[PDB]
Design a protein around this nucleic acid. Structure first.
Ligand SMILES: [Ca+2]
Ligand SMILES: [Ca+2]
Length: 117
RNA sequence: GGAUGCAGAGAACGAAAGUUCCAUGACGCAUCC
C-alpha cells in the first residue's frame, strides 16, 4: 500500500542520510517506537519498508504522518532499514527523531519528498 | 499460559558443541485473569 513511488536516487539519498544521522542524531527502528514517535510529535522523518508481509503492519503509518505533518518515505527493503541504529536487525519502519548535524540535508530531502505530492 | 501498560536489545538452557525465540518487539518489570 504505497501512497507514492519514490525514485531510486531519492531512496538512496534518504538511506544514506540515515547512516550519516546515526552518529550526531537520534534514530528509532521498528513499528512500535516509530508509531509512538509520530504520535508524540517527535519524528523528524519516517522510513517505511516496501516488502512488509502482511503489509497491514505498516499501513497505518502514512495517514498518521499526514495527521501529524510528518514526512514519510518508502524504502525498498526492510534490510536496508536494519542498519538504522544499534543491533543489525531488519526493520519494517524507522524514524529519524533528531536531524542532528545534517540539518540542510534533511531539509532538501523533505523538499524533494513534498515534491512528490 | 492469557489480557493490559512502561521501556526498547539481544534473551533463555547449556561447561560448550549447540538448540530455541527477537524491532512483524523477544527478554524483561509491574497490574489483573
Ligand atoms: Ca548474548
Ligand atoms: Ca551459562
Amino acid at each position: 500500500y504505497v501512497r507514492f513511488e519514490v525514485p531510486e536516487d531519492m531512496q538512496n539519498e534518504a538511506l544514506s542520510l540515515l547512516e550519516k544521522v546515526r552518529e550526531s542524531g537520534k534514530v528509532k527502528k521498528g513499528t512500535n517506537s516509530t508509531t509512538l514517535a509520530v504520535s508524540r510529535g517527535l519524528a523528524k522523518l519516517v522510513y517505511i519498508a516496501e516488502d512488509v508481509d502482511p503489509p497491514e503492519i505498516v499501513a497505518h503509518l502514512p495517514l498518521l504522518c499526514e495527521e501529524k505533518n510528518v514526512p514519510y518515505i518508502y524504502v525498498k527493503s526492510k534490510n536496508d532499514l536494519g542498519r538504522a541504529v544499534g543491533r543489525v536487525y531488519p526493520g519494517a519502519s524507522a524514524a529519524i527523531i533528531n536531524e542532528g548535524e545534517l540539518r540542510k540535508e534533511l531539509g532538501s530531502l523533505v523538499e524533494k519528498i513534498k515534491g512528490l505530492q
